[PDB]
Symmetry: C4
Subunit: 31 residues, 4 copies
């Protein structure tokens, strides 16, 4: 209902960090 | 025509998830 | 000078795709 | 206090490039 800020923008940011957590661990575990 | 929200922002978010789907599968298939 | 849209948002989107091009090729060349 | 632009958007952009720096080096060091 709030057009001030769509959840897509916020979700995109959250996903970015989330991926880093998984990607970061993958690097540590495997090269 | 609508300057309220550019497609670039929306597309960027979609791409993020899209990449995760491919990247996620790659990890499962190969380390 | 234009506060309508910052270049950071546009650049971020461009970078996303750009990375995919390099990342995509890397997968094809190496698993 | 400034609703003109949230730090999440700016941070997201910074993270994108930051990840590339680490990801780019990883590729150079290891395939
Ligand atoms: Br327009 C816009 C607003 C916020 C955006 C963040 N998008 C990305 C897309 C992919 C590259 C980087 C980091 C992750 C994944 C999020 C930027 S793009």
């Amino acid at each position: 209902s709030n057009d001030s800020s769509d959840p897509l923008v916020v979700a995109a940011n959250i996903i970015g960090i989330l991926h880093l957590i998984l990607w970061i661990l993958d690097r540590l575990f495997f090269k």
